[PDB]
Design a protein around this ligand. Sequence first.
Ligand SMILES: C[C@@H](N)c1ccc(I)cc1
Length: 118
Amino acid sequence: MEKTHVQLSLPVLQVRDVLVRGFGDSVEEVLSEARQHLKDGTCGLVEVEKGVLPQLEQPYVFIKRSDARTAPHGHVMVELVAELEGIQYGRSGETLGVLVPHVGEIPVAYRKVLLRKN
Ligand SMILES: C[C@@H](N)c1ccc(I)cc1
């Protein structure tokens, strides 16, 4: 039975290594697929810098900071927000990165998060 939050260590991928550059074709589908890949352990994270988003596919799924007061165990509390054509679905804090499927790419680091399973 699903707790409200789950501790995960997400592999951080470089954008040019990512083979599957998004989760789907609609805001509702990308949030659904992101959540399922997170449960299956097949989700990576790309940190956002200049040049990154134009190399990925919309709609985007971002993990954003949900609580600026405590970060339990070094796991920052986060929630999902999708973006399509400049419009965001959800409101949250600072972006930690953009989520993508992970299909065996070698990561450069891991990001510890406490994910709100909304
Ligand atoms: C089942 C497996 N081949 C797979 C990997 C990545 C995605 I996205 C969907 C399915």
